[PDB]
Amino acid sequence: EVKLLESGGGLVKPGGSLKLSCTASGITFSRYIMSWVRQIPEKRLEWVASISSGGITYYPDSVAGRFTISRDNVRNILYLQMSSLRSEDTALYYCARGQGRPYWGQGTLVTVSSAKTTPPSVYPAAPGCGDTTGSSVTLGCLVKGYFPEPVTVTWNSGGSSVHTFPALLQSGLYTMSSSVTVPSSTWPSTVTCSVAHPASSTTVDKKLE
Amino acid sequence: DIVMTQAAFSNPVTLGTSASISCRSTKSLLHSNGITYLYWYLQKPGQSPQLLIYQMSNLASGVPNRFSSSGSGTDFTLRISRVEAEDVGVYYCAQNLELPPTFGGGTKLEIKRADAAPTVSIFPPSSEQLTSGGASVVCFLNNFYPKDINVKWKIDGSERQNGVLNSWTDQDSKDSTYSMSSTLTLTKDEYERHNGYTCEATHKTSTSPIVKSF
């Protein structure tokens, strides 16, 4: 197989440092111009650093002097040592073999802030007094008060009518809801929303009624 | 730097027909070896970027031949034949001819379909939430089309515009519709001194605003 895997991301205080790493199967880093790129909220990729096969390093002004890209040719590992981190550095960082047919990993999240990692509060959203109790019912789970943003809502895994809305920041904490739809002829069969928040190593399962 | 330019949007495309996404570079991407170093990738909501085409005309792994790219060294066109609902997302062109790596701003692919009214479902604060002092009322306006819509809140007949938060999804990869949620957040105290909350949704399809209250 051929794949790149970034790791090392997480929460960091402004002015702090962090070291990202990248390993791969099927790609020999020493032979290429290897790079690091990052994806911020804007969702438009930004080049962070590159290192040629010759070992020459390249950096944009945005990180010049604070970031250092390096490679361990023997163990086949790519690194990105970050320092004097700024809030503007918050993003999803990708490791990439850009030449020819580009390859990149799933990315690793780096969050720079003083804020605290808070677990999510999950509240069930089901029909109560006087509702459209019939064919096709809209159920849901409200998730609020968490941080960082990365959170995943899964419905019995077999969810095809799910609608997970973009999380919104509120007073420093994120909030989002997820709705699901199923025919009333199967409502009394157990509908559960599983909220996962790796940031706080928390997973909350709420069974609607 | 080699600047890559694409329009932010393209006209809505009918399912089953072809879509064309343009892109241009400030410098030819045609290398001396005869290869043109242009690649295209796709970004769908909640997914990592996916390579579609590289070296101008080579399909990446798992990419159906409905996708193709053509053009010169500075002007290119990504073509998607027989557009499918799952094709919605943002298409990016980029160059890997030289450093520094540069990328286009991305072009969002819009799918045109038949109008649809929003399925509205409202929910009162949960008991578990009230026991903590909080009080947020939620209502979903799901699977509607077009994406243009507007929700209004009414507490005891009065309009409560303050304290409301709205969140919209991207075009659905399956049904090509849009969805959104409206959440009026307040203290359990403010919530108690009232009763009868209204989630009003006025679309442009019908003249009968679908309103739900409790």
Ligand SMILES: O=C(O)CCCC(=O)Nc1ccc(/C=C/c2ccccc2)cc1
């Ligand atoms: O020989 C040369 O100088 C030309 C090659 C230069 C090069 O590596 N370019 C290059 C470097 C990195 C990328 C990364 C692209 C990417 C795209 C999507 C997600 C994550 C990363 C894309 C291209």
